[PDB]
Design a protein around this ligand. Structure first.
Ligand SMILES: NC(=O)c1ccc[n+]([C@@H]2O[C@H](COP(=O)([O-])OP(=O)(O)OC[C@H]3O[C@@H](n4cnc5c(N)ncnc54)[C@H](OP(=O)(O)O)[C@@H]3O)[C@@H](O)[C@H]2O)c1
Ligand SMILES: NC(=O)c1ccc[n+]([C@@H]2O[C@H](COP(=O)([O-])OP(=O)(O)OC[C@H]3O[C@@H](n4cnc5c(N)ncnc54)[C@H](OP(=O)(O)O)[C@@H]3O)[C@@H](O)[C@H]2O)c1
Lengths: 474, 475, 476, 475
């Protein structure tokens, strides 16, 4: 264990108060993180706005060089960081190391994407003959101070996915990690500090989101809020933003649509991998199967066999299903499972709970009257909902308040493309599970799944504006 | 003559039980009445739009463009007829009002052709991860859905069409809420789209005073996007009611004209006067404050003065440069700014005079930062000259404004001007010319309280679309 | 009815030459009119006029250049029946198909005007590459290449003239159109529309004449900055020998394969194959010219295709027959020789060969093998071979063994597999479950290998005929 | 000492039965030998490349970029080792030669990252016709195939890497033919790619005598694209052999520096001398004629003279500004241009001297356009000053050249400079700076006899890629 500190203006600062963090799978004390005051928040933001000018006037290639160095340090320390990340969020050890490696990949890719963004030269004579000698030189500029707020389930990857695109464009950044996950966020900050990031260009803030969360968001030093987390918290940020630009990555209830001509064993393989990864604690993850009646019995059997084979255990043993993040999360999941059983759903795999380790539960004959048909569990439970027509599958899929991603399993690709056009989601994966990657692809959600478009180049465009200089050629 | 106007709702023209009478600001002549819609009538507009969306988005781009081209041709045909009423309704010079209609047709046509050739992206998984080299993402644009377009009094046709046409080409459905003062002109624009045969519900209008109906139309869950041009306080309120939904806001401006020691003063004076006093200063992009190096301030002020004195002051029907302001409260607000500036010691190079709401153009010199006129947007024919001692002071005063729409720099050192422009917190910097929204293909955006989002034709199309990514593995 | 003496457009005037070429309708021998037989000195005058006009033309706004193109398109629509009627006779194209060609030409001209007028430049940052250059920016704007020589083909003498002229003109180039001799009347009728639209003198000009007098001369001339050619592979190869350092675009021959897998919709494959293969009697570079069909479905597919080939009408252009007389006797002789080689080597004639004059009835062969000329050579006539293959790998191998690489069709219900096949096909475009085709004209059109060079389709053609001018300075 | 070098052929290092001994132009020192390949050995290079193409083009972008980054890291590691030999081989200053190698690594790394994130596009049939609204075209990038890259003696590593890396990232395979003088440097570059693990046959080298394989290399049917830098007459020969294969040509220049009456004359002189006399004038991009308004010509000429007199003249190992020219014929040619200018009455402001092939830097004033030096590319250290009385005359004289690579304009009036730039028949105009190829992300191209095609990193990648379209109908 150890006492961690926030990065503030190039200096590691403790706070009067602190919060102790324990491993959710064991209760092991992992350390403590500062509990920041509002004056300490003000100082973070003040140093950031002070460093902005010297940072934005650096060349793109100099800013990229800092990001590449930080990524190299993360790769070097992937095992040491991952070992702690695995404990802090009860994620499989290997999966935690992989998250660190993927973060380095995103940081490097953002550095090189951001140093070659488009600038435009527009001709007045495209619109009006009298203006044929007038041209507009349009160049991108940073928005200023970006507040990045990462979630517990990817506390390093979904911090880096915000930090690096912001920094390459010339923004300064403050990272508010989740409390459960704050040690991992501060370990990420260490890599940026060692890389030599100029004082104040990147800073961290730790403290209970339920105490300082509103304060850090409504502070007028913040020019942009980039948030990943729960839908209700995101909704609140959408109000406190006013006219300030934002990005919200919220909940999902991704549907896997399985048509009569699908490869059922292949559909089952992708569905189980996607639904039960990290115990279902992922926004982009198959959370409901909408399967045509004729093949539903066969598909359910294929899924059941796979779910029964999943390992259920501790993070150190790289179990497929690990303990959920906290007791409230496990209670909520158990509640959803109980509601489905009470309303008559068929439990194809057996429920069991030891501490907060819930064994994976597959339900068949789930109906739209059951909470599990709609609510995001963030736990290892998966409903199968039988449908009679493609039209009905589309209707049920779109009736969700969420619209992150969908999967379509079928051998008729032109038809699948037509269905994809009708689904109110950001991304449709054909014959594969839903996923955020690859990280160059757009990542976005409709409806209550959030706002804005991420993926690397899209994230950079979001956290920049344009400056147009217009003049007349003689 | 004075006609009773109706809203376009699901392809039909509909009256309401209550209406609003509209008078010409320059004469008091009654021009007609427009409906005062109920919340239930708004619900019907939105329901018809959402019902029409599926069949509209499934048309080809070229079919949607054909409707817009036909609407634009009708506007050109009726430009004189529409311009004459627009001129009376907002007290805009007759020829300028006809020009607004012609420009609207140009924007509609340009948006139709820009939007039909918007294309998508194919992204390679192998750009990022070797194991994903057979995975590609087919990324195509889609409409956001129902766009609520809210236009302002000063360009009630042009800044309606600048929202409607980009929205429609992309496959969105649209409800237009014009300004009450300007609602007749907005409904005249709607007639063109109806005559072009726009399918029922694809384009609709809503009228009923923003002070009464504005909050309900914005909060309504049917609306997927809000595209607003108007005052900063109204824009802020819309920002709150939008929640997570995308919005575009084009709000107030206090554009600075920075005049350096090496500037051509005759040309700077010409551009400053044209920009500051166009439409009596009732433009968000007007030159609204001169920041001039002291060593050229006396001669610049004198050359501006000579031009201000030559401006005609009269009625819209006579194509006067300075026409009566939109309403009495607007003229009172401008008079108050003039009074404040005079009380604090500014020099009135031209004399204040007011007959009804026709204020003569007032040029002030020696304006200081303690005067309201240095900061607040007047929306009237008054221009302050603020003297600075260094270019750094000009940058600081320019950026101290809460507004950040555009700026002008007058100088003969362009490399230095480019470096100045990089530091100005605005969307667009014009070198050796007045600020202006055009040409309409160029980006138009404002920093700080001047709004959110980027317009100009292609940018407005991109704003009112989202993307749909379809990912698959090649075998 | 009344044959006319036609003239070239040269510097805004209509000019005869001392000698001329009489053009006869291939289907009937009817004298249609004459076009000038220009001398090298007259070519010089065309090019001198063009280079003189280039200054005032490239400096116009995009809006002003676009207006001329839109007006020319409007005139073509107005005169589509009049122009199509003569085009039909000149190249023995069905009357309705010739009118359709004119209408399609107006569509491409209008689309090119609107595509080109909104093209943009870019601004690049020195600091993307080196910190010391962070204040250096490059303002990069588009410019024309100069004088474009556009050479159109007999089989689309209007459409594939307009596909070159309009992209060139919107970008600020000046243009000289050399139509094919058989097709020169149609090209000069197109020129009349641009002249009536008010195209400034010398901005657009025409050249007609004999290859033996001016053929190489028009291409080698130093005034020409770009050559844009559609025609046969051997003529294209010659233009490559004479192009030197100047950019060119070549749209040459094809032998497009239609790969029909076991899981294909065979009725749909047959319908598309026959439409693509026999349109304009097979006188198209983009056209199904060989069926590569998996053994298990070959009998069924052959029967479907046979039925549709038998329904094709064979006759005169005025009667809108599907199969019209070929462009000349040499072309028909060449086609007959390919048919005889296949017959003598044991291919099965599923429909009967007949020839009257240069009117060849449509011939479908089954059991064609790679030792037969018809497996490889582009006929430009109404003959189609079916080649039975055992695997998709063999279909890919045989398809890619061709010296041509224009397009391919894949008929299958497995699209992810079809994409994997398309990646291996050495062609410009692969159509899934559809015949090969140039359209829609916004899509890229290009040929690999001996099928051409460069990428057309509207925006791609404008890109090819534009360069850039960069202005670089340091911000202070 | 002097080593026998080998060609990289299908992952193996191959001598040939005959070789070419390479000597240092400044000293006569034997540097080593390169193989004199036969036509059958060229066949083996090309067969190896075409066999490697299938597995190379189907690797992921990231895998291809990783090889390029590794090659660049090795070049940086070995920059002195390679640069020291490059310096001797082409009589380039030692520091400049090492810097060339470093710049090559920068270009290789930048090309890898530019190329790996290239994208395809999806086009809508409904943009063009309603009946095709369900038809989409998935357009993806593909390599052209085998690129023949021919580097120049004056940048035998940098302008090899500028072709190789853009080709490779896009999935092309490459054969590099260095010039004989400059073949050792080319083979040293190849060693870096081989050590980086470039797969066998993906990158190969050809060396030999023109009399044996010169035309054969270019005419060979395996070659799909020719990318050449060199002299105009040699490039003209390549053009006569390209057939239908796409080419790119970077040929000669006669860049003008136009100096107007308001120019900063000290800045102009500094840039003019740096650009004109770098590498003894043996650069295609380099100020080669000053076109100066007569009112400022005396002062400009004096400022240039003072700088030219400071230039060091001597050996490559001593980083002399002016080193010996590439061979005797080149120096003879330059001496002839100098003599013609002297005999026709130009003023020699600095003195001509020749020792071996080391020519001292010669600045001429009062050059008239009947002098060969006004027009012919010298590739030697001689600079004419031509006085004009109007900008229009400067433009005419500039454009009268058969060359059109770059131009410089020195003036404080940028809107005017931009208008002049529009009229100059060149690829790039630099304002208040010498002409230069960099930064390497910017476009680099020549008009007229200066070449064909657009380079600079992303432009070079575009040039060596084509597309494959897959079109289907949505259901
Ligand atoms: N779409 C995506 O890409 C994505 C990815 C991952 C997760 N998610 C979603 O996020 C949810 C799970 O994440 P979570 O449990 O960490 O969410 P959460 O409880 O909303 O917390 C998210 C983050 O916001 C902070 N926060 C809490 N209250 C705040 C406030 N009032 N103002 C500002 N910030 C505040 C939290 O700090 P504290 O920890 O101190 O409360 C934490 O750092 C699920 O709904 C999941 O679908 C989405
Ligand atoms: N940035 C630009 O591009 C641009 C262009 C033009 C004008 N403007 C700005 O607009 C202002 C002048 O226009 P204006 O006087 O018409 O401004 P405004 O009073 O804000 O009105 C703008 C529009 O919003 C409507 N509205 C009023 N209250 C509303 C509410 N609560 N919710 C929703 N909509 C509501 C108005 O309808 P009613 O008429 O019924 O109240 C009108 O249609 C100036 O500040 C000027 O700078 C900006």
């Amino acid at each position: 264990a150890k006492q961690y500190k926030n990065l503030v203006n190039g200096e590691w600062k403790l706070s009067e108060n602190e919060i102790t963090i324990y491993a959710p799978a064991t209760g092991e004390e992992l350390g403590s993180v500062p509990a920041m005051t509002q004056a300490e928040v003000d100082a973070v933001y003040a140093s950031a706005k002070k460093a902005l000018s010297d940072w934005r006037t650096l060349s793109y290639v100099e800013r990229a060089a800092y990001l590449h160095k930080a990524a190299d340090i993360l790769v070097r320390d992937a095992e040491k960081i991952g070992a702690i990340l695995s404990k802090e969020v009860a994620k499989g050890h290997k999966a935690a190391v992989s998250e660190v490696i993927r973060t380095a990949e995103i940081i490097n890719y953002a550095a090189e994407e951001g140093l070659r963004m488009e600038g435009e030269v527009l001709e007045g004579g495209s619109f009006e003959a009298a203006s044929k000698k007038k041209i507009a030189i349009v160049r991108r500029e940073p928005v200023g101070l970006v507040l990045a707020i990462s979630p517990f389930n990817y506390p390093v990857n979904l911090a880096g996915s915000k930090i690096a695109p912001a920094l390459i464009a010339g923004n300064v950044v403050a990272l508010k990690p989740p409390t459960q996950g704050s040690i991992s966020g501060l370990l990420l900050a260490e890599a940026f500090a060692e890389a030599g990031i100029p004082a104040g260009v990147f800073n961290t803030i730790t403290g209970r989101g339920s105490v300082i969360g509103d304060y850090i968001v409504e502070h007028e030093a913040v020019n942009f809020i980039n948030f990943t987390g729960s839908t209700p918290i995101g909704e609140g940020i959408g109000k406190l933003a006013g006219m300030r630009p934002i990005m919200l990555e919220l909940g999902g209830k991704d549907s896997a649509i399985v048509l009569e001509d699908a490869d059922l064993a292949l559909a089952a393989k992708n569905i189980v991998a996607g639904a039960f990864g990290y115990s279902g604690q992922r926004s982009t993850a198959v959370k409901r199967v909408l399967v045509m009646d004729k093949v539903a019995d066969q598909l359910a059997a294929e899924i059941k066999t796979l779910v029964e084979k999943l390992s259920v255990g501790m993070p150190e043993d790289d179990a497929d299903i690990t303990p959920l993040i906290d007791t409230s999360a496990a209670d909520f999941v158990e509640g959803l499972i109980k509601d489905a059983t009470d309303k008559g759903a068929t439990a194809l795999t057996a429920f069991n709970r030891e501490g907060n380790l819930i064994s994976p539960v597959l339900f068949d004959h789930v109906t739209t009257d059951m909470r599990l048909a709609w609510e995001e569990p963030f736990g290892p439970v998966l409903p199968i909902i039988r449908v009679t027509t493609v039209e009905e599958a589309i209707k049920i899929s779109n009736e969700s308040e969420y619209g992150l991603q969908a999967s379509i399993f079928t051998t008729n690709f032109p038809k699948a493309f037509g269905i994809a056009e009708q689904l109110e989601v950001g991304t449709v994966h054909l014959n594969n599970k839903t996923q955020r990657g690859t990280d160059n692809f757009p990542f976005l959600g409709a409806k209550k799944s959030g706002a804005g478009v991420q993926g690397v180049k899209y994230s950079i465009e979001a956290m920049t504006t344009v400056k147009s200089v217009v003049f007349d050629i003689q």
